[PDB]
Design a protein around this ligand. Structure first.
Ligand SMILES: Nc1ncnc2c1ncn2[C@@H]1O[C@H](CSCC[C@H](N)C(=O)O)[C@@H](O)[C@H]1O
Ligand SMILES: Nc1ncnc2c1ncn2[C@@H]1O[C@H](CSCC[C@H](N)C(=O)O)[C@@H](O)[C@H]1O
Ligand SMILES: Cn1c(N)nc2ccccc21
Ligand SMILES: Cn1c(N)nc2ccccc21
Lengths: 257, 268
């Protein structure tokens, strides 16, 4: 964890959400694939309710772009103060906020409701009620007296669990911890890196547990979920850039039984 | 009657036309707000998109008539024509297009329109690709006077005859009266091949608009007058739609009551 104290949000954003990984023009790219997974899942109309919590949001909002129109109360979270501040800058439209508009545009494009990207962002900013500290290693990841409405009707989390866990076991426990935040019959949308061991965020060099699709499937099962959907994106050569060693990205739609 | 005087007044008035003021008056918010699906921006784009989506309007060459400083009218068209000719009476408008073509920062920003076109075309295209294709496909930007029997002049560079014509807010805005309008329509029709298509957008019952210092006269026309002119010019009218300007889009930049869209096909 101490490694995360060197984590630079801007370097992370630049490494993963600016070209080439952040060019959304190519439909075969990872950015479009992720947004498409999220969009399609919400378009089924089976993931719904009043409140949602995003786990380990970091400095990113793309993971909620499709979500925000299904949940009137959204709580975003991260372990790091610097990440929560970077979120603030975007949520409050403060100077030097990250430009997510390519992702907003592409989400509007994929969803196919003819919505302008500005309305999309407006709705996201309006529904994100609070940004809270979190530690998925604690049995109560949000603390004891959290301002967050619990239990949530739905969880989202992207690139967090594998990226903060030393090994499979710690990964499984983290999953158990966040699962307690979710109402029975509720939904989890989980995005993660496949077979990754490290990545860079400026001066920070972080350790990642290398996990497979079957390992992810089994963990979800062991945590008491029914796996509704589990998809893999194999990382093409051109998006393997020296900022990490990720091999693929997985998307899992799980329902707490 | 005699047309020269009226046409001379038009030419004179346009010497004060200010492209930036025009762009801001008509293509920046609220008229340029593409978020409201009931707004005039989305309606125009939809009309053009849907028309091209029939697949009935294709060919190799397209001529946009009186482009002015705008490109929105070509956003859906550019997927269907490899060779596009843009045109305008005013050099300053052609320069404005020059800026956009060169992708200069000082150029007007059409990205809201590009994105929206991509949104309704429903092909998952990013707006940067839409724009890159339009820039690639614009082969020339030429002077034009619709009041001349040969609007492009004698021996123009443009591929003639064209397979398709586009024209937005030009004819009525440069014609002193309906007779002049009809002649202008007759003139541009000589540029279209038999069997080719005209997509025409225009103001209904407009008599004036502002472009900075310039205040310009417009012949007020109705939908029925437009239909009859198209028939009179040798077209079969395939589609003619009317958009009624809502009060909140009537901003004192003009006295437009509505916008027409016409899809017409030249007989032959
Ligand atoms: N012990 C812990 N508990 C919960 N989140 C943690 C954590 N240690 C680090 N994090 C956060 O986990 C994130 C991994 S990076 C991914 C962030 C974002 N959700 C994405 O999709 O890009 C970082 O924001 C990091 O600060
Ligand atoms: N005699 C003439 N022949 C052809 N175009 C003319 C003309 N006199 C003025 N114009 C052009 O007619 C245009 C009307 S404004 C409309 C411009 C653009 N097509 C749009 O949709 O906004 C101006 O650009 C003006 O310069
Ligand atoms: C590992 N990883 C993170 N943390 N963000 C990403 C975006 C695209 C591809 C891989 C990514
Ligand atoms: C008359 N007119 C022009 N010339 N451009 C317009 C855009 C929207 C609505 C009306 C318009």
């Amino acid at each position: 964890a101490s490694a995360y104290q060197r984590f630079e949000p801007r370097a992370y954003l630049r490494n993963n959400y600016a070209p080439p990984r952040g060019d959304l023009c190519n439909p075969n790219g990872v950015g479009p694939w992720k947004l498409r997974c999220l969009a399609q899942t919400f378009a089924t109309g089976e993931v719904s309710g009043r409140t949602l919590i995003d786990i380990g949001s970091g400095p990113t909002v793309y993971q909620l772009l499709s979500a925000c129109s299904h949940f009137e109360d959204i709580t975003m979270t991260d372990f790091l103060e610097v990440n929560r501040q970077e979120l603030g800058r975007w949520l409050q439209e403060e100077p030097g906020a990250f430009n997510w508009s390519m992702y907003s545009q592409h989400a509007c494009l994929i969803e196919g409701k003819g919505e302008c990207w500005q309305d999309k962002e407006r709705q996201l900013r309006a529904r994100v009620k609070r940004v809270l500290p979190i530690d998925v290693h604690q049995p109560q990841p949000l603390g004891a007296g959290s301002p967050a409405p619990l239990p949530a009707d739905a969880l989202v989390s992207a690139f967090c669990l594998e990226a903060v866990s030393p090994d499979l076991a710690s990964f499984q426990r983290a999953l158990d911890h966040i699962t307690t935040l979710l109402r029975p019959g509720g939904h989890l949308l989980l995005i993660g890196a496949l077979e990754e061991s490290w990545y860079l965020a400026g001066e920070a060099r972080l350790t990642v547990v290398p996990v497979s699709e079957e390992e992810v499937r089994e963990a979800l099962v062991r945590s008491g979920y029914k796996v509704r959907d589990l998809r893999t994106y194999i990382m093409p050569a051109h998006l393997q850039t020296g900022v990490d060693d990720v091999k693929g990205v997985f998307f899992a739609w799980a329902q707490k039984v």
